[PDB]
C-alpha cells in the first residue's frame, strides 16, 4: 500500500530497490534501549562530560517528550510515522524517507556503495 505514497514522492524506476534496501537495512540496524547505568576507561573529556551526564537516570524523563516544532512538511509520511508505525515498519518508513530525500536531492541513498577512502596509498612505502 506504500507504493501509492512512494509513487507520489518519486518515480517507479528506483522504487523497489529503495523498498528492499529500506527493508533489510531497517531490520538489520534496529536499535533497542541497552543499559548504561552507573553500577557497572575514559574517553575524550569533551565527549566524557556528555557520557557521564547520560549515565544517570535522573537526567532522563519518565515518558517520551513528543516533538512540537513541526518539521518535514513537504514529506508528510511523518503524519503516520509518529505513532501508526512502531515495529519494523517504523524504521522501514524512516529508511525509505531518507532514501526519498537522497534521491530527490539526486545523490546516492545507500551507505555501503559510498566506497571507502582507501588510505593504504599513503602508508605503503617499503
Amino acid at each position: 500500500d506504500i507504493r501509492e505514497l512512494l509513487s507520489q514522492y518519486v518515480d517507479d524506476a528506483n522504487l523497489e530497490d529503495l523498498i528492499e534496501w529500506a527493508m533489510e537495512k531497517s531490520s538489520k540496524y534496529y536499535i533497542k534501549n541497552i543499559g548504561n547505568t552507573k553500577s557497572n576507561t575514559k574517553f575524550e573529556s569533551k565527549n566524557n562530560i556528555g557520557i557521564e551526564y547520560s549515565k544517570d537516570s535522573r537526567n532522563k524523563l519518565s515518558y517520551r517528550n513528543k516533538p512540537s516544532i513541526a518539521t518535514n512538511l513537504e514529506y508528510k509520511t511523518l503524519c503516520d510515522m509518529i505513532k501508526g508505525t512502531s515495529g519494523t515498519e517504523k524504521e522501514f518508513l524512516r529508511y525509505l524517507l531518507f532514501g526519498i530525500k537522497c534521491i530527490k536531492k539526486g545523490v546516492e541513498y545507500n551507505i555501503d556503495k559510498i566506497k571507502d577512502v582507501s588510505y593504504n596509498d599513503y602508508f605503503n612505502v617499503l
Partner: protein, 48 residues
C-alpha cells in the same frame, strides 16, 4: 689551610658520626593541582 684532597659536604655528630644529606622535593606546588573526585566533579587546589 686547604687540605688538598677532602671535598667535605658532611656533618660530624655528637658521637663522631659523619652525617650526609640529600635534597628533597618540596610539598608546596608552584602550579595548581587538578583532581577528579567523582566523574563530572573536578578539583583545583593551589597554595600561597
Amino acid at each position: 689551610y686547604l687540605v688538598p684532597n677532602v671535598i667535605g659536604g658532611v656533618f660530624i655528630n655528637k658521637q663522631s658520626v659523619e652525617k650526609v644529606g640529600i635534597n628533597l622535593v618540596e610539598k608546596i606546588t608552584t602550579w595548581p593541582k587538578f583532581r577528579v573526585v567523582k566523574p563530572n566533579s573536578f578539583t583545583f587546589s593551589f597554595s600561597s
